[PDB]
């Protein structure tokens, strides 16, 4: 149930490296977990809202696209 711990520290380190980060404190990982969780709630709430208004039970990628678009984060390559 602790899927937030499914985000292991190697993945966080890899993301930091792609972000150009060289030295990382040990307290960083949990902070990233929390921030990512907040972002996920913000997106998923709107995605579920769109899914429900369409009277559907399966979330479509277009729902996620709309949710991201209305949050100011436009995504291409999915429709």
């Amino acid at each position: 149930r602790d899927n937030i711990q499914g985000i292991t520290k190697p993945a966080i380190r890899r993301l930091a490296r792609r972000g150009g980060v060289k030295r990382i404190s040990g307290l960083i990982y949990e902070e990233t977990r929390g921030v990512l969780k907040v972002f996920l709630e913000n997106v998923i709430r709107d995605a579920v809202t769109y899914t429900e208004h369409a009277k559907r039970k399966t979330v479509t990628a277009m729902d996620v696209v709309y949710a991201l678009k209305r949050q100011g984060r436009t995504l291409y390559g999915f429709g």
Binding site: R18, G19, G20, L68, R73, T74, L75, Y76, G77
Partner: protein, 107 residues
Amino acid sequence: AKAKTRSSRAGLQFPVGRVHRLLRKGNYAERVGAGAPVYLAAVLEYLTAEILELAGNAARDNKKTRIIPRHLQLAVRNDEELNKLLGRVTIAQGGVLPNIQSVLLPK
């Protein structure tokens, strides 16, 4: 007489008729000017040509015959005006520009 595409009359490749239909059905205004879809298709075609040229250049620099999302991301981020235009646009599998801060370099 024989049907002639309005794009051919304007010398464009983008479908002016489809653009006009979408403008009509897009609930933007009650009436649509006749010269509107031509203008819009021309602008779209110009921007498409610009970014396609940059992406083809990037793909050639990678010795690849097909443009990939990485090429598109590199072309967009490298072009200042294009990057500013797509400031809040995220490209899937586009990666990032290879950039490392100076102070992190070995000295």
